[PDB]
């Protein structure tokens, strides 16, 4: 189906404890494929998926240079942002950036992204047009004016429509064994008595890839959204994900409850009930 490539970057200042730490990771879909950490003993971009290992030394040299240069511009940016927000030099602050592209099944660009946050808050984002900006506040408007003057958006558009899409196509081919395989959830329902009057029903989804899933409970065919405890989808550590959804069921009502599961690896959505 559709696919994405995303690069994530975080710099965190630590006054009195050296220079800001810089961490960047790259993903295709929900698969980590590269990482760089400035606190590593000998910082280099390193592979994290088998299909990127075949890239040759020129790729790793170039990527490592880009990462080191970005660590440095982030340090400058952290200094700039103290000025823009009238802040002291004493505190720790955070700068985040994400960029990348989404493509459809035919490999064509669906949309691109390039966006920043400062101290956990949206700062400036490239709009879906790849030509104009959304600034969150009057500080980000100063950046907007600078980036308009320098025609930054045009440079980003060229990358996002060109290299970003073409890299993703290459990776999807080289990684076709895994990137183009959906692992469906393994599903079951468990029952956990609470008191004489009620019990929990928990609907499980295990071992699935990619992470996107829908997992709901119905009672007599009516969605139980407000009464469902739905945990965040969580990584298993073997590339796959896990999720569960639970409801509190009055004694004797179990067969009125059904769990519904939707995932791209399922040819049809599943319906499950507790099986004593």
């Amino acid at each position: 189906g559709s696919h994405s490539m995303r690069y994530f970057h975080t710099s965190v200042s630590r006054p009195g404890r050296g220079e800001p730490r810089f961490i960047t990771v790259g993903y295709v879909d929900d698969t980590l494929f590269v990482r760089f950490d400035s606190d590593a003993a000998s910082p280099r971009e390193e592979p994290r998926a088998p299909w990127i290992e075949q890239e040759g030394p020129e790729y790793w040299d170039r990527e490592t240079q880009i990462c080191k240069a970005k660590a440095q511009t982030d340090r400058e940016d952290l200094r700039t942002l103290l000025r823009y927000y009238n802040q002291s030099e004493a505190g720790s602050h955070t700068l985040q950036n994400m960029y990348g592209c989404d493509v459809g099944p035919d490999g064509r660009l669906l949309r691109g992204y390039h966006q920043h946050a400062y101290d956990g808050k949206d700062y400036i984002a490239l709009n879906e047009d790849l030509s104009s900006w959304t600034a969150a506040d009057t500080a980000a408007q100063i950046t907007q004016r600078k980036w308009e003057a320098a025609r930054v958006a045009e440079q980003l558009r060229a990358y996002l429509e060109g290299e970003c899409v073409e890299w993703l196509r290459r990776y999807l081919e080289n990684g076709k064994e895994t990137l183009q395989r959906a692992d469906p959830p393994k599903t079951h329902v468990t029952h956990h008595p609470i008191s004489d009057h009620e019990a929990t029903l928990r609907c499980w989804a295990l071992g699935f890839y990619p992470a996107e899933i829908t997992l709901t409970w119905q009672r007599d065919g009516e969605d139980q959204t407000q009464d469902t405890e739905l945990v965040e989808t969580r990584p298993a550590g073997d590339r796959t994900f896990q999720k569960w959804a639970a409801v509190v069921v009055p004694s004797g009502e179990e067969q009125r409850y059904t769990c519904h599961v939707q995932h791209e690896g399922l040819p049809k959505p599943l319906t499950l009930r507790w099986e004593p």
Partner: peptide, 9 residues
């Protein structure tokens, strides 16, 4: 592969 385009706020 990454964007090689220095961009400062």
């Amino acid at each position: 592969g990454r964007l090689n385009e220095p961009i400062k706020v």
